[PDB]
Design a protein around this ligand. Structure first.
Ligand SMILES: CC(C)=CCN(C(=O)N(C)[C@H]1CC[C@H](c2ccncc2)CC1)c1cccc(Oc2ccccc2)c1
Ligand code: NA
Length: 259
């Protein structure tokens, strides 16, 4: 790689992210005053556990679909073989979503934008997975302290996805080369903007790994309690990525062949 090749990669990654960021940051910032009232919070707590699980799985599935589009527009991703594209998305799409979520998190009052308004952890009490919920809020709180720019989220989420250590990669050297160029693009941009200090403050990879692991652990607990709800009302892509065995569906393959 070269310098001009890396500067071109920065603008390419940022462009691919702007086209797929799902929610406008300005919209999220303007809605900070719009907070769920105590009566609305009580309504969410009164909903059944299985209805809250269905709505959250639907919101995650929608967010993951924008991450799949981010990957398809990400330089070098479609050059990889279809096995490696699927391995990288199965392992990283949820992680990219968890990072993108800090844009919807307000560290001032410890609330998150959810279904039109901002609400705290107590909004999600009906799910019956308080440890997972608090972990999600803590992770978003950690990233808020860094004051990420939009270009920084673009370059960082690209690296979260292009991880040459994921098990099952067939062309490991090809993914290594792509990750190295993206790492250079990230660091070059942090150097050009005098933001290298955040490198030591980025969360360890095990933090994103623990979140995904908790989500699968809590999903299995819920699937045991309401199996027909998962079977009949959860999104098919969600079941393919997270529920055992849900893998037979082949939705990821269709999203990648499309468009
Ligand atoms: C449980 C909870 C606190 C919230 C429900 N939900 C959720 O808010 N989302 C998916 C948003 C993720 C961030 C998205 C976005 C995109 C771009 N810019 C800003 C934000 C917008 C959708 C969510 C979060 C994280 C794991 C998750 O998976 C679960 C969790 C519990 C049960 C089932 C699935 C859902
Ligand atoms: Na934030």
């Amino acid at each position: 790689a070269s310098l001009t090749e890396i500067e071109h990669l920065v603008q390419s990654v940022c462009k691919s992210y702007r086209e797929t960021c799902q929610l406008r940051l300005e919209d999220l910032l303007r809605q900070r005053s719009n907070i769920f009232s105590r009566e609305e919070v009580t309504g969410y707590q009164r909903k059944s556990m299985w209805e809250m699980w269905e709505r959250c799985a639907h919101h995650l599935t929608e967010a993951i679909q924008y991450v799949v589009e981010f990957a398809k527009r990400l330089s070098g991703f479609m050059e990889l073989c279809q096995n490696d594209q699927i391995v990288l998305l199965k392992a990283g799409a949820m992680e990219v979503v968890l990072v993108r979520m800090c844009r919807a998190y307000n560290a001032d009052n410890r609330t998150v934008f959810f279904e039109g308004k901002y609400g705290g952890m107590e909004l999600f009490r009906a799910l019956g997975c308080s440890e997972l919920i608090s972990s999600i809020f803590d992770f978003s709180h950690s990233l808020s302290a860094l004051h990420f720019s939009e270009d920084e989220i673009a370059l960082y989420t690209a690296l979260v996805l292009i991880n040459a250590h994921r098990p099952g990669l067939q062309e490991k050297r090809k993914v290594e080369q792509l990750q190295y160029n993206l790492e250079l693009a990230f660091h070059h941009h942090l150097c050009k903007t005098h933001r290298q200090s955040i490198l030591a403050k980025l969360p360890p990879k095990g933090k994103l790994r623990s979140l995904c692991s908790q989500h699968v652990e809590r999903l299995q607990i819920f699937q045991h309690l309401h199996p027909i709800v998962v079977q009949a009302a959860f999104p098919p892509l969600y079941k393919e990525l997270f529920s055992g065995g849900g893998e037979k569906h082949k939705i990821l393959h269709r999203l990648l062949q499309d468009s």
